[PDB]
A paper describes a structure:
TOPBP1 and its fission and budding yeast orthologues Rad4 and Dpb11, respectively, are scaffold proteins that mediate formation of multi-protein complexes in a range of essential DNA replication and repair processes. Bioinformatic analysis suggests that only three of the BRCT domains in the yeast TOPBP1 homologues, and four in the vertebrate TOPBP1 homologues, possess the required cluster of residues needed to bind phosphorylated peptide motifs. Despite the structural similarity of these phosphopeptide-binding BRCT domains, genetic and biochemical studies show that they are nonetheless selective and specific for the phosphopeptide sequences with which they interact. To gain some insight into this, we have determined crystal structures of segments of yeast and vertebrate TOPBP1 that contain the two most N-terminal phosphopeptide binding sites (BRCT1 and BRCT2), in complex with phosphopeptides derived from a number of different known ligand proteins, including RAD9, and used this to develop consensus patterns that encapsulate the individual specificity requirements of these two independent binding sites.
Mbd1 is the S. pombe orthologue of the metazoan DNA damage mediator protein MDC1 and plays important roles in the DNA damage response. To try and identify other potential phosphorylation sites on Mdb1 that might mediate its interaction with Rad4, we searched the Mdb1 sequence using ScanProsite as before and identified a good match to the motifs defined above, centred at a documented site of phosphorylation on Thr113. The sequence around Mdb1-Thr113 matches the TP/SP proline-directed kinase consensus and hydrophobic −3 residue seen for many TOPBP1/Rad4 BRCT1 and/or BRCT2 interacting sites. However, based on the presence of a polar residue, threonine at −4 our model would suggest that this site would not display high-affinity for BRCT1. We found that the Mbd1-pT113 peptide bound to Rad4-BRCT1,2 with low micromolar affinity but showed no binding to Rad4-BRCT3,4, the equivalent of TOPBP1-BRCT4,5 that has been implicated in mediating MDC1 interactions in the metazoan system. To determine which BRCT domains mediate the interaction with Mdb1-pT133, we measured binding to Rad4-BRCT1,2 with mutations in BRCT1 (K56E) or BRCT2 (K155E), and found binding was substantially reduced compared to wild-type with the BRCT2 mutant, but was largely unaffected by mutation of BRCT1. Based on these observations, we were able to obtain a high-resolution crystal structure of Rad4-BRCT1,2 in complex with the Mdb1-pT113 peptide, confirming the preference for binding to BRCT2. The structure shows the Mdb1 peptide bound in a very similar conformation as Crb2-pT187, Crb2-pT235 and Sld3-pT650 peptides bound to this domain, with the valine at −3 relative to the phospho-threonine packed into the hydrophobic recess, while the polar threonine at −4 that makes the sequence incompatible with BRCT1, is directed out to solvent by the β-sheet conformation of the peptide backbone.
Author numbering:
A (entry chain A): 5 to 186
B (entry chain B): 106 to 114
The structure:
């Protein structure tokens, strides 16, 4: 049982895939949890914007946040008879740090703007030069201007750039209230 | 009343 000792929980995984992941994980030797219990070791996440993800990032940084592809790929490799690496593909299927983030900026000059786009791309997010209603985070130098006012109207998170640096350090999207502008 | 707020020129 390669996943002996692993305890897997899901968040923002569709019911069909959740069933697939639970069964394959259990057949690989893992335990499966519907609720986020203390013994969970891996959180398979389809989104950052859920109570379970927020709980992991805030209170359980020991827990590994995984993409939905991890268990299907590991399972197939295992039943195909291939010799599993001792890491069990975990290092290849961490959820990208800024997965599903769509990051826009305002009131920050060059080259800082160019560097921010570079880090958003390297850490798995989408960079948005124009504010749209689907942006998830507006990094603002000041709480003023057109992008900022439409972010308020569109209910978009407005954060200071430390949100980006600390999320990158943590390998998880941190919550926005911790990075609200003064 | 806009689709986007364009990147600051």
């Amino acid at each position: 049982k390669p996943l002996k000792g692993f305890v897997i929980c899901c968040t923002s995984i569709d019911l069909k895939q959740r069933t697939e992941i639970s069964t394959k994980a259990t057949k690989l030797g893992a335990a499966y949890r519907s609720d986020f219990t203390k013994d969970v070791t891996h959180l398979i996440a389809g989104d950052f914007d859920t109570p379970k993800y927020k709980f992991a990032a805030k209170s359980r940084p020991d827990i590994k946040i995984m993409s939905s592809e991890w268990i299907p790929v590991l399972y197939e490799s295992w039943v195909q008879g291939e010799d599993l690496d001792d890491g069990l593909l975990v290092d290849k299927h961490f959820l990208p740090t800024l997965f599903k983030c769509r990051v826009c900026l305002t009131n920050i000059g060059q080259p800082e703007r160019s560097r921010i786009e570079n880090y958003v791309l390297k850490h798995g997010g989408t960079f948005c030069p124009d504010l749209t209603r689907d942006v998830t985070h507006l990094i603002a130098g000041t709480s003023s201007g057109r992008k900022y006012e439409y972010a308020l109207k569109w209910k978009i998170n407005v954060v200071c750039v430390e949100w980006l640096w600390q999320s990158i350090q943590r390998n998880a999207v941190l919550e926005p209230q911790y990075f609200q502008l003064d | 009343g806009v689709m986007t707020v364009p990147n600051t020129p």
